[PDB]
Each structure stands twice: as C-alpha cells, then as structure tokens.
Paper text:
CG30463 is predicted to encode a ppGalNAcT/PGANT, which is an O-glycosyltransferase responsible for the post-translational addition of the sugar N-acetylgalactosamine (GalNAc) to proteins, a modification typically found on mucins and other secreted and membrane-bound proteins. ppGalNAcTs are type II membrane proteins that belong to the CAZy family GT2731. Interestingly, we found two distinct Drosophila cDNA clones emanating from the CG30463 gene, differing only in a ~30 amino acid region (the α subunit) of the lectin domain. Comparison of these clones to genomic sequence data revealed that they represent splice variants of exon 8. This splicing event generates an α subunit with a net positive charge (isoform A, containing exon 8A) or a net negative charge (isoform B, containing exon 8B). PGANT9A and PGANT9B adopt the canonical ppGalNAcT tertiary structure where a ~10 amino acid flexible linker connects the N-terminal catalytic domain to the C-terminal lectin domain.
PGANT9A crystallizes with 4 molecules in the asymmetric unit, and each molecule contains electron density in the active site consistent with a catalytic Mn2+ ion coordinated by the conserved active site residues Asp 301, His 303, and His 437, and 2 oxygens from the α and β phosphate of UDP. However, there is insufficient electron density to model in a peptide, and the partially ordered active site loop containing residues Arg 440 to Arg 448 is in a semi-closed conformation. In PGANT9A, Lys 542, Lys 543, Lys 546, and Lys 547 in the α subunit loop form a basic patch that extends towards the active site with the shortest distance of ~14 Å from Lys 542 to the nearest UDP phosphate. Arg 526, Arg 533, and Arg 556 form a distinct basic patch at the opposite end of the α subunit. The distribution of positively charged residues in the α subunit of PGANT9A creates a predominantly positively charged patch that extends the entire length of the lectin domain, and the proximity of the positively charged loop to the active site suggests that it dictates preferences for substrates that contain negatively charged residues, as the positively charged surface could form non-specific electrostatic interactions with the substrate to position it for catalysis. Likewise, positively charged substrates might be excluded from accessing the active site given the position of the positively charged loop. Thus, both enzymes have two distinct charged patches in their lectin domain formed by the α-subunit that results in preferences to recruit either negatively (PGANT9A) or positively (PGANT9B) charged substrates to the active site for catalysis. In PGANT9A and PGANT9B, the loop is closer to the active site than in the other ppGalNAcTs. To further interrogate this model, we redesigned the PTTTK peptide to replace all positively charged amino acids with negatively charged ones (PTTTE peptide; PTTTEPTTTEPTTTE).
Residue numbers in the entry: 143 to 448, 452 to 650
Write the structure that this text describes.
C-alpha cells in the first residue's frame, strides 16, 4: 500500500469540499505558497520513479571510495510533512556510509511543529542534528552556520522542500572524489506546488546556468561547444553558474573560497558570487545529469522583507566583475547606492590569485551576449509628440504574451534598457522584440531573424521590421506601441538609440 502520491503521481482534492476543509487548504497556501493539505496526505516516505537515463545505470562507472558528505538543509517555518520528506529522502536513497550528518539549520522559525516536536521525532535518528539560530538571519548566514557545525570532508546543501531520487548521491560525490576543486549540482526537477506531482525529463533537454545583466540567475540550454565535449548527454556538463541552494562542494574548498560574502543581505546573489569564485579561483562547476533532486517550485516566497537586491548585486560586481561591472550599473540607472564595506572580499580575491573576469567570460561563458558589443544599448527614445516617450516593457516568461508599450523616459534603465544587436535584435537579456501582425511582444530570442529582425535606418531614424515591411511608431495617446506604413516625414516614427555606434554593424 503506497498511498496518495505514490510514484510521484499527482494529488487532486475533491471538487466540492466542506468549509473547514477549504479553510485548511487555503491555510496551507497562505503559510507555504504550495498546497500543504495535499502534501500532508502524501507519505513522508513517498516513493518516486527512477528518473535516471539508461546511460547512468549501465555505462557510467563511479569510483569505489567516495567522500563522506554532510547534508545541510536550512529552513524557516517549513511545513512538517515537507521538511520531513526532504530529510527522509536523504536517509532512504543515500548509501549509509556516505552520510555523516544531516544538519537542519533553524533560522528562528516560530511555528510550534519545528521546535520540540521536531526534536522528539528525530530523536530516534542519530545522524540528524538540529542547530538553532538566535535571530532570523536569512539563508546566506544560515548555510554558513551549518558549514561551521559540519565535520565531514564534503558539504551538500538542499532546500527544505526537496526530494532526492534513486542514485542521487553517488554521481555528485564521484566528481569531488576525482578532483576536490569541483563543485557539482544535481539536475533540479519540478514538484508541482499544486499536486506535488514529480516531473523529470530526458538528459537531452538539460539546462545549464548563466545570468542576466541585472545579476539574476537564468537558465540556458547546453551550448554546442559543450555538447561536443561529450560522447553522451548524460555525462557531467560545465555550467558557468549554479541556480544555488542545491549543490555539493568540498568543505575546506568552500572555506578557502570565502564561503558566502558576510556583508550580503538576505536578498542575495550569493549563488552568483559562489559561481564566479569557483571558476576564477581554481575550480570548476558541473551539472551532473545522472543526479536528480526534486524541488517544490513556488510562484512567490512568503518571507518577511526585513531596488533591494541592489546591495548584494553591487558588491558582487564591485569585487568580482572587473570592467564588466559597468553593464550591471547601466541596468539599474547607475544608482549604485551604498553597498557597505567590501574591503575584506577584495583582499580575499587577491590572496587566492584568481583569474580576471574577462577570462571567465572568454573561456567559461563565451556564449553570453555582452551589451557593449551591441550596435546600441540603453534607452530607445521616440521623437514624436514631445519626444519624452520611451520604449518600455518588462522581460521574462510571465510578461510574454504582453504587448510592449510606451512610458515617459526616466533615465534609470531597467524597463527602458534595450540593446540593438548586430543580428537585428532589439533585446534585453534572452528576450527579443517580435511582431507577427497583432501586437509587438517581448519573448525569447530564437536567433532566427525573421519576425525578431529589425533595422535602424540612420538617416531617417526609423526602426524597420524586415518581414512585415512596416515601421515602429507610437500613437497620439503615447500609451500604445504600434506598427504602420513607413513614412519618412512622420515624427512618430523616429527613434534615437542610446550609444549608437555604426562600426559595431
Ligand atoms: O529566512 C529564510 C527563509 C528561507 N530559508 C530556507 O531557504 C531554503 C531556500 O529558500 P527558498 O526555497 O524560499 O528559495 P527558492 O528556491 O524559492 O529560490 C528553504 O529551505 C527555506 O526554508 C531560510 O533558510 N531562511
Ligand atoms: C583538478 O580540478 C579542475 C578539473 O580539471 C582543474 O581546475 C584542475 O587543473 C584539475 N587538475 C589538477 C591537477 O588538480
Ligand atoms: Mn526552494
């Protein structure tokens, strides 16, 4: 008898339900930003399907002597059944002799079930130790507390809403056992927040980590330069950056790299910091397609707030990004703010004798588009009806299927930051302007030109669409961004593009 959710199948609550049941379902969504009521019906030892490729069972060989790892799971107000299932998943699917301590770091959670109730439950489980923080300090400082209580040669981090799968630990530990400067992440699969269903995929469609120039992590598929390094797609692949929070690193190597920046605030790109340090200071970062961990992805985080990631992102750039720091500052309007004292980190970098950031981009992440190489980058200004209207929209996968609009120019960047590429893209990060006969849209650059292809006609100042033959323009209300027949005499069809350089063409 496996129960609800056995083998990763979804769980759906009745269509019509009593009121007390409704209150509890909503109670669960309010507290956790997933459906706790569903999670509570699912076994804490919920069985899962084997997501590993044929290659991972048959043709992959791992060294016989692997380093003992500690597992650090930070949490704050995590749900009972969810936290337990993460811990029970490590114990049940990891070879006993490879787990030293399962360290649960508390970070000043206040819900009763994580206090004494957790202590009594894991009393029977000797490898589980509970460290309690004295005040809410956030993820970054908590992982550092866990690394201080850990004595095993290797650290492995997991969120409190994860599920390890069959064979998850050996392929990660194998990479470190070959070479200790190697940081590794499992493939991070999706557990539905609504049904807790488990979703895994072919090692063909594996994504490797990069970043947008707002210093946010972002996924991209494995570059061909990398795929050509491998006889099979299930071998470990280089990844210029980690998503963060699920990874394994050598404990002393973690220490040597300065762990996380002590001066970061909660809103941190510590994941980006650790990634750059690993590459630039004698290590490598790998995604191991043979290792799958499920994670409960949430649409929002229900945490107290204490723009705002700006401090952590500027320290990351002031220390680690050399001349390329300027490209982050453009996106935030050069309002760098006050990132605090950062001297300790500059000394740390010099003592380790790390490579330059250009080296990182040139050798590890050369696929990344550098805004300085574009024909123009900055705001896109329309000269019509006052000349104080700018191309303005948000990017991302939620703001796909939105029409791109217009808004008054604030020289602050962000939503009015764009690059005109040599390949005729008007873009922000991996998003491209696109026109297929209804509205102008921002979605994902496919690199095929066509409807994502534009021409800036220097003498006329028009933005010309190759396939529709139309010209880009703004309406009289200045609220909408439309396509119309090209007329040289129309001011609503004129644009000036910041940093236009003819020679980048
Ligand atoms: O102040 C906090 C809030 C979050 N968490 C924990 O940090 C882990 C990762 O956080 P989260 O899942 O919210 O980040 P995400 O994966 O959504 O980016 C989770 O186990 C949380 O319980 C924490 O340690 N301190
Ligand atoms: C070990 O770690 C990485 C993997 O290639 C690399 O930086 C380093 O040169 C490797 N070699 C040695 C001798 O440690
Ligand atoms: Mn998470």
């Amino acid at each position: 008898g496996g129960g609800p959710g056995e083998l990763g199948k979804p769980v759906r609550l009745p269509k019509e339900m009593s009121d007390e049941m409704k209150k509890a379902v909503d109670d669960g969504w309010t507290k956790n930003a997933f459906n706790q009521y569903v999670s509570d019906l699912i076994s804490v030892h919920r069985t899962l399907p084997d997501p590993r490729d044929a290659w991972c069972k048959d043709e992959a060989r791992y060294l016989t002597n692997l380093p003992k790892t500690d597992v650090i799971i930070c949490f704050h107000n995590e749900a009972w059944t969810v936290l337990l299932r993460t811990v029970h998943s490590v114990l049940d699917r990891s070879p006993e002799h490879l787990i030293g301590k399962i360290i649960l770091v508390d970070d000043y959670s206040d819900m009763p079930h994580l206090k004494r109730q957790l202590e009594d439950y894991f009393a029977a489980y000797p490898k589980v130790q509970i460290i309690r923080g004295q005040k809410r300090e956030g993820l970054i400082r908590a992982r550092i507390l866990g690394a201080n209580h850990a004595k095993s040669p290797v650290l492995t981090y997991l969120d409190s809403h994860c599920e390890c799968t069959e064979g998850w630990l050996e392929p990660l530990l194998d990479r470190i056992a070959r070479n200790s400067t190697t940081v590794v992440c499992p493939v991070i699969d999706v557990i539905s927040d609504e049904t807790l269903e488990y979703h895994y995929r072919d090692s063909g469609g594996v994504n490797v980590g990069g970043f947008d120039w707002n210093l946010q992590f972002s996924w991209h598929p494995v570059p061909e330069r990398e795929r050509k390094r491998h006889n099979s797609t299930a071998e470990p692949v280089y990844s210029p950056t980690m998503a963060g929070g699920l990874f394994s690193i050598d404990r002393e190597f973690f220490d040597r790299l300065g762990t996380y920046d002590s001066g970061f605030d909660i809103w941190g790109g510590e994941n980006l910091e650790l990634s750059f340090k690993t590459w630039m200071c004698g290590g490598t970062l790998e995604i191991v397609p043979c290792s799958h961990v499920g994670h409960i992805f949430r649409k929002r985080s229900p945490y107290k707030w204490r723009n705002v990631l700006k401090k952590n992102s500027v320290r990351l750039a002031e220390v680690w990004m050399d001349e390329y720091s300027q490209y982050y500052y453009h996106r935030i309007g050069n309002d760098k703010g006050d990132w605090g004292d950062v001297s300790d980190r500059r000394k740390l970098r010099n003592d380790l004798k790390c490579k330059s950031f250009k080296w990182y981009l040139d050798n590890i992440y050369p696929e990344l588009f550098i805004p300085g190489d574009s024909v123009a980058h900055g705001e896109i200004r329309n000269l019509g009806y006052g000349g104080r209207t700018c191309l303005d929209a948000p990017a991302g996968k939620k703001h796909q299927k939105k029409a791109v609009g217009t808004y008054p120019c604030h020289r602050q960047g962000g939503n009015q930051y764009w690059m005109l590429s040599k390949a005729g893209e008007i873009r922000r990060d991996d998003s491209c302007l696109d026109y297929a006969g209804k509205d102008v849209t921002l979605f994902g650059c496919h690199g095929g030109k066509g409807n994502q292809f534009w021409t800036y006609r220097e003498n006329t100042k028009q933005l010309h669409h190759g396939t529709s033959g139309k010209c880009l323009a703004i309406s009289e209300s200045k609220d909408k961004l439309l396509m119309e027949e090209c007329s040289a005499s129309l001011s609503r069809q004129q644009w000036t593009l910041e940093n236009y350089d003819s020679s980048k063409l």
